[PDB]
């Protein structure tokens, strides 16, 4: 009976009580049932005309916001706020509408007037987060310092308010790089928060979990600032304090797990992972951190299986997928991957369009042996803030080194000359090098470590030019970085590679031995694996093959997929006249080239010929001619001598 409702509400007029609610109901009915915004607005203008007061003007503002007319909403909030200047809720609703209408100076000055009149706790946050989102972090800093310029008030509310103002000033000081002041502000918040707790326990005990959690979060931020100051022991201490406040907060558990990891306690890290997984089984970071610890403990089957279980809970998960892909690369079990792409596609038909899928797919093709398809799939990801940033680094790897060679390795850079002496290979490769600098210009850094890794890879582009001034500049940046950080593996590999290109091979040799003594880690892993291969080449130049074999096998122990680790080892087995074990290495290199390495194709057929396996040799001579028609030498020497033996 909509007309019974409207006629009753219309029978409430300017001289009667509750006319505001009656006209709001008329407005609401006309918007719901007649779809009429003008009947809604005229009912609301009747409220403004007949019953002008601060609450009716506030409600009129909110009505105009539901109607998407914020200018009349601001007129309504003005008609309220000039009458009740004490209401911080109205001043904040005023602030919201002024922000939605670019009236930022009015919002700022209303919040300043509310703060100067001593209004409620959150107004420091409203003004600070506004100024922060406007990137005026310095204005927020000065505002929060001015909001703390009083002698600290001993009231339980004011202690907690000043504690939150101090926490918020520390959150701003983080963006100011003022991390010591952030610690002092957080310790001053911890001092205030102790005074809060020692009254709350006696006069407000129902607030204890929230106030303990705020004390935990203060201790967590003190710990974060101490990580940025490289005092990881203070970081463990103040995250242990954050646990002593709250033993079961997901981020505090995960962060002390990260620090038990970072300070080489994998057992206490596994305790925090197990507790976190018991508190929530679907915590992806705890599963992946636990899987990495299983991988470090060589429980690779568990590391895989826990990421597989997490993908069977969450099929569309590009972090867990890309972690599982590298576990399967390091195990040498790449054939298991396509299942997990199909699971994402089955859950989400659009998954193929997503930059994290495109990043995971781009990684796979680089490991199967298709650098062009890897580049195509990385390129589709490349602008994304996570997946595109990580794709760009792998595009730069391919654009620097598309054949994945030891740059300056004498066992193979003295070969390939029928292509390597051509302008076609030279100019196309050097264009890829000179445009890897543009991929590096797309890697905008957000940390000093990001700037250093960026500068190193720009200097890897400068090395890869082989122009002497560029290679000397690269050596100089690498030696400058190594002088600032004597263990910085990507710079030490830079020094060695530049020295090899400069023919200063004795200076390269010691700077690689320097790396070879260090323990491996998952971040420097590729530069470790490259450095061991470049040092193994230099050891083959020295003919001391035993140290090369050790480096090649150490490389395979950290990553069983490495085709170059096998291809160098197969060459040593052929030098040692072990044509069978050479054929085993060449069979892996044939397989993991996706049969695109016809030089290994020749070697594999030739080693089968010498092993008195003439049918197997002829099988491979067909596979080489299939892989490449008109490929030189093989037909006459291998294929026709294997045929000629076949019945003697």
């Amino acid at each position: 009976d909509i007309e019974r409702a409207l006629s009753i509400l219309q029978n409430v007029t300017a001289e009667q009580p509750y006319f505001i609610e009656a006209r709001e109901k008329m407005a609401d009915i006309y918007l719901k049932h007649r779809k009429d915004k003008m009947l809604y607005i005229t009912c609301f203008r009747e409220i403004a005309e007949r019953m002008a007061n601060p609450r009716s003007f506030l409600l009129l503002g909110d009505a105009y916001m539901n109607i998407l007319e914020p200018e009349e909403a601001i007129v309504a909030y003005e008609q309220a706020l000039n009458q009740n200047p004490k209401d911080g809720t109205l001043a904040s609703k005023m602030g919201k509408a002024l922000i939605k209408t670019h009236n930022y100076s009015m919002a700022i000055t209303y919040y300043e007037a509310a703060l100067k009149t001593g209004q409620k706790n959150y107004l420091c946050y409203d003004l600070a987060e506004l100024l922060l989102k406007l990137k005026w972090y310095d204005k927020a800093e000065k505002v929060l310092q001015h909001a703390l310029a009083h002698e600290p008030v001993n009231e339980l509310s004011a202690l907690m308010e000043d504690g939150r103002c101090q926490v918020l000033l520390a959150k701003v000081y983080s963006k100011m790089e003022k991390l010591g002041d952030a610690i002092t502000a957080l310790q001053q918040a911890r001092e205030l928060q102790a005074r809060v707790l020692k009254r709350v326990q006696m006069e407000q005990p129902d607030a204890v979990p929230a106030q303990k959690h705020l004390a935990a979060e203060i201790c967590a931020e003190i710990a974060k600032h101490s990580v940025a100051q490289r005092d990881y022991e203070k970081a463990i201490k103040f995250y242990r304090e954050a646990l002593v406040h709250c033993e079961t907060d997901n981020k505090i558990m995960l962060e002390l797990a990260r620090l038990y990891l970072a300070q080489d306690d994998p057992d206490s890290c596994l305790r925090q992972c197990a507790l976190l997984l018991q508190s929530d089984q679907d915590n992806e970071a705890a599963t992946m951190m636990m899987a990495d610890l299983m991988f470090r403990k060589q429980d690779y089957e568990q590391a895989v299986f826990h990421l597989q279980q997490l993908l069977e809970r969450k099929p569309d998960n590009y972090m867990t997928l890309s972690r599982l892909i590298d576990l399967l690369r390091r195990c040498g079990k790449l054939e298991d991957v396509p299942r997990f792409f199909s699971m994402a596609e089955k859950r989400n038909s659009r998954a193929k369009l997503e930059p994290g899928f495109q990043y995971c797919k781009g990684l796979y093709l680089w490991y199967t042996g298709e650098p062009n398809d890897a580049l195509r799939h990385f390129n589709k990801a490349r602008k994304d803030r996570d997946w595109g940033q990580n794709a760009l680094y792998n595009m730069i790897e391919i654009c620097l080194n598309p054949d994945n060679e030891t740059v300056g390795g004498e066992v193979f850079e003295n070969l390939d000359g029928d292509l390597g002496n051509s302008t076609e290979k030279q100019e196309s490769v050097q264009l890829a090098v000179r445009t890897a600098e543009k991929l590096l210009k797309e890697l905008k850094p957000q940390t000093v470590q990001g700037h250093v890794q960026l500068r190193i890879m720009e200097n890897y582009c400068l090395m890869a030019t082989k122009q002497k001034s560029n290679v000397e500049q690269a050596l100089n940046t690498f030696t400058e970085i190594a002088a600032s950080e004597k263990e910085h593996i990507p710079a030490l590999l830079g020094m060695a590679t530049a020295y090899m290109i400069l023919k200063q091979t004795p200076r390269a040799r010691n700077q690689l031995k320097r790396i070879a003594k260090m323990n491996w880690n998952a971040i420097d892993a590729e530069e470790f694996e490259k450095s061991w291969l470049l040092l193994a080449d230099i050891y083959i130049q020295s003919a001391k093959y035993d140290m090369a074999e050790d480096l090649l096998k150490r490389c395979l122990r950290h990553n069983r997929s490495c085709c170059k680790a096998y291809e160098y080892m197969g060459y040593i087995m052929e030098k040692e006249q072990a044509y069978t074990d050479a054929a085993l290495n060449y069979e892996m290199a044939w397989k993991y080239s996706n049969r695109t390495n016809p030089a290994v194709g020749y070697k594999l057929a030739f080693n089968y010929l010498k092993a008195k396996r003439y049918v197997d040799s002829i099988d491979i001579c067909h596979q080489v001619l299939e892989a490449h028609p008109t490929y030189p030498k093989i037909r006459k020497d291998i294929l026709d001598k294997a045929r000629a033996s076949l019945r003697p």
């Binding site: 062009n372 580049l375 195509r376 390129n379 589709k380 490349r382 602008k383 595009m395 654009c399 196309s428 264009l431 890829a432 445009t435 890897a436 543009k438 991929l439």
Partner: protein, 57 residues
């Protein structure tokens, strides 16, 4: 393929993703159906066929 040859995957769509070289809209662009499925023709429909076609997809 060069870097420029790959960048063709992004070059055309950038004009819908981006405004004045200052703003990026990609979060909103997730709603868009692709141009070749959004295009329409001056071609007629009949109920038997239109039902058969919609049933065949």
């Amino acid at each position: 393929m060069t870097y420029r040859d790959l960048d063709n995957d992004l070059m055309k769509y950038s004009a819908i993703q981006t405004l004045d070289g200052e703003i990026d809209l990609k979060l909103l662009t997730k709603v868009l159906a692709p141009e070749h499925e959004v295009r329409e023709d001056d071609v007629g429909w009949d109920w038997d066929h239109l039902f058969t076609e919609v049933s065949s997809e």
